[PDB]
Ligand binder design. Sequence first.
Ligand SMILES: *Cc1c(COP(=O)(O)O)cnc(C)c1O
Ligand SMILES: *Cc1c(COP(=O)(O)O)cnc(C)c1O
Ligand SMILES: O=C(CO)N[C@@H]1CCCc2ccccc21
Ligand SMILES: O=C(CO)N[C@@H]1CCCc2ccccc21
Ligand SMILES: [Cl-]
Ligand SMILES: [Cl-]
Lengths: 360, 363
Amino acid sequence: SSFKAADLQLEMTQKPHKKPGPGEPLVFGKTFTDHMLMVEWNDKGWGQPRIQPFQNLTLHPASSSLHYSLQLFEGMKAFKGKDQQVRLFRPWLNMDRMLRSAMRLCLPSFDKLELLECIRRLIEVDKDWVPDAAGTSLYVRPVLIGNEPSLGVSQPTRALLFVILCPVGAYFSVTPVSLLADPAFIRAWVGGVGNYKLGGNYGPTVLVQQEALKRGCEQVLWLYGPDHQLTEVGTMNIFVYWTHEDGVLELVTPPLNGVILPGVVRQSLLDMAQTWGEFRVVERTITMKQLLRALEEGRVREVFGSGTACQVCPVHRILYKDRNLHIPTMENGPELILRFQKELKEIQYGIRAHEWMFPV
Amino acid sequence: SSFKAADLQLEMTQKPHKKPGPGEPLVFGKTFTDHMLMVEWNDKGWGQPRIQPFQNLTLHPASSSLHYSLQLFEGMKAFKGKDQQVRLFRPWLNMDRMLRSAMRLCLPSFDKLELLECIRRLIEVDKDWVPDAAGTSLYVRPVLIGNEPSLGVSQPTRALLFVILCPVGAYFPGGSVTPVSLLADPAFIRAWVGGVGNYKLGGNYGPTVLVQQEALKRGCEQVLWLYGPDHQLTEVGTMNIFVYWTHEDGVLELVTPPLNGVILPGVVRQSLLDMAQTWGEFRVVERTITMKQLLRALEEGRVREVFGSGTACQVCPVHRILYKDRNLHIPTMENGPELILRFQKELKEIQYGIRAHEWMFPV
Ligand SMILES: *Cc1c(COP(=O)(O)O)cnc(C)c1O
Ligand SMILES: *Cc1c(COP(=O)(O)O)cnc(C)c1O
Ligand SMILES: O=C(CO)N[C@@H]1CCCc2ccccc21
Ligand SMILES: O=C(CO)N[C@@H]1CCCc2ccccc21
Ligand SMILES: [Cl-]
Ligand SMILES: [Cl-]
């Protein structure tokens, strides 16, 4: 039995913080807003949600969130249009995804629309924090952690669902990135949990990302299997725009076979391209073997990653088997990329009205 | 750099918890002692270590420990012998394993002998919490977590090291004596080669909860984790698995899976190999074990004992494995269980100070 948005408790800050300075560098995830949502669950079901000042968490030292990684998160954006109106991009898919993560970790179920409403209310209260400068947004970070005060590994009897907000500018995306493609690093496995947005999938990538910087790359290209499938880039889904082995122009991204996180932007790019009907759009396994041949034969136009933070990130170099592979993404416009960026921007900032946007 | 035991600050508690009484059996991991260790790290390095009252943590909402699972833990035991002297079992090895975990997650390094001293100092303060009844001990849980107040996925600039203590009795109900049943379904993967299954990291355990529930639903108490096309037996629950049998070459052997990435290198595991190796009475090997081999060893009556090892259980017999829909009887209890009993007996004598040994670290 879910918490309800009707029952919200508002508690406004006693001393508001000073928003970032216009033009000053908004660093991603370092700056937070005045308020936060917090909801507690226990053996008396969910409690009343509350909007409250950005305050620390008080956890029992045995909290299962900290011992056995009973934690999952989401990530989505609110955009402030010209008319100072704020909109969430396809938040329903994030609520869908968060509930699936919750179940995977035996965490408590909740009503998707109730949480979206509390999020709406939370953003409303802090709507001024939502910046309006070009390419800026409010990053929204929901989290659900276990909070069992016992060392047993078991279905928790207690949990906390909370939400924080960051004004953001950018994360790197007009400029492309280099990838490290080393098969020894494995992000996720079939029958694993790489397809859920659980905190435990990210911690182990930190050292890997360091090795990429050490080898002069900016991101990890997570390979999988003996045929070296391209699964994902850092925390982004991967797309390739190429002329395929059968001479047909297509946009491919790996299918959702377990080792791919089902990105909201990924789906949106699939959706958007289908609607155009101008080229083939497919979900198919992509191997290094295939990418090398394609590059040698000049059939590759663009490689890019997708995700909420970067939206669409061009790729121009992959360090594979100790040798750099050039990727002509930037030579080729990048047309598909710039076109995707434009329409997403038009939609997100309200230029074109669209069912994907949810107004705050 | 590191924190130093010489710099320990002590804040004794002003509100002692009521210790557990008689007719109140110990539930594993639910009862905590009066004090905790706590050490913070940041840009200025490791702060000063302190033993303080058992209290809640105060965490920034963006704490990387909660969003990207920058968390690891340990688990070891303190045993009070008949003379009332308290000893830790091979703690050095837990410190070795904790530092390896920390490096894998880019968390701050520390001096093992310094943490161990702090842990000793901690247990000394809460010495009266250590039970002395047969099969009771004090379970010690160190933890290291990232504590960056930033949603970026990166090497943290702040961490928190803490240690809490639990007086414990048995882990399973009538545990180590009464055997357990296992669900062995190859749909479930605990870890993969090139993953982090060989580190004691929080992230490895949360996904298993649902699987544990599936074993209950199917009438089993534990999960036998299989890996690979040839269904290798990796671990059981949170224990390393061992098989004592007459292998296909007709030689009597104790086998356990090798440390090739999907196996958590348990201290009890390592100890059982050391003990058996030392004895020199049968062949002791680290080798992959597959279901095909087990099925064949069973139908040819070559298996004597199957069991799990780990700090909580110690040595745990298995009597049944449900392989998809085939219910396999494991004759562990009909074979004594002779090796299990021997291991338990020698571990008991070492742990409770019946027989002085270099494996025990006096508190
Ligand atoms: C969050 C995430 C993505 C992209 O998700 P969006 O919903 O598009 O922002 C891709 N891959 C991984 C591994 C992720 O964690
Ligand atoms: C802790 C643990 C073990 C056993 O470790 P010991 O050091 O023997 O207590 C075995 N397997 C897993 C998965 C573990 O987490
Ligand atoms: O939204 C995206 C994709 O561009 N990345 C975000 C950026 C913050 C760090 C992080 C960590 C885990 C999962 C997503 C993310
Ligand atoms: O000591 C052992 C093995 O017998 N298991 C412990 C028991 C507490 C629960 C847990 C959770 C994760 C890793 C180890 C453990
Ligand atoms: Cl999926
Ligand atoms: Cl190892």
